[PDB]
């Protein structure tokens, strides 16, 4: 009952979600979700082989309801922390943990050889019931400890200027104007690294960094 076709699709939506996932890893390997991202991945690729050998016109006994429910579940996994990324990164750290937990019961669960369809598509639910219910948790006050999501966005903003400084300073400005921007990097470093650093302190710096990397492009070539 599970098609060729199909079978390609599935594939498909499961590499997409594996490349999302990659990609946020990326921005926030410190992130309470990403404790398991190597079980999750290695699952992946165990379900697109299964899949494959179903895409490729060759029978597998492999049961599809379930195939199916380890597709939607790792599709739904990539889809949670994609909002959870670009939506919750200034809600208090217990949305983090709670969504966090969720997301490592679904990657234990989709790993899990004795999976039942029931407990997959539960575990989809509870992806679901927990997004939506720590999307209403209140957020950070300026005044409290940047959790690692603040961070990643001041980390964001460093790598930021610094590509942006090679391509755009070095190549065409002058050593002060170059070292000048150096040292506003350096400060927002220093708070980057700063383990009680408040929220206020790391958007001021992201601040700072935007108001040097402009005077700087602005100031005159050679």
Known sequence: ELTPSEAQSAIDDINAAVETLKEIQSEEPKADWSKEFDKLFATATELTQSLAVVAGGYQTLANPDLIMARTHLIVEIGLTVDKSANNLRYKIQKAHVELG????????????????????????????????????????????????????????????????????????????????????????????????????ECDAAIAKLNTAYATAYSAPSV
């Open 101 to 200: 937990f969720s997301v490592t019961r679904a990657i234990m669960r989709v790993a899990n050889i004795g999976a039942t369809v029931y407990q997959l598509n539960d575990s989809i639910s509870d992806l679901r019931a927990t997004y939506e219910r720590v999307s209403t948790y209140r957020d950070l006050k300026s005044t409290d400890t940047a959790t690692i999501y603040v961070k990643d966005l001041l980390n964001k903003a460093i790598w930021n200027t610094r590509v942006a400084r090679d391509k755009e300073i070095l190549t065409h400005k002058n050593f002060r104007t170059y070292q000048t921007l150096n040292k506003e990097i350096t400060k927002a470093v220093r708070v980057w690294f700063k383990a009680k650093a408040t929220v206020a």
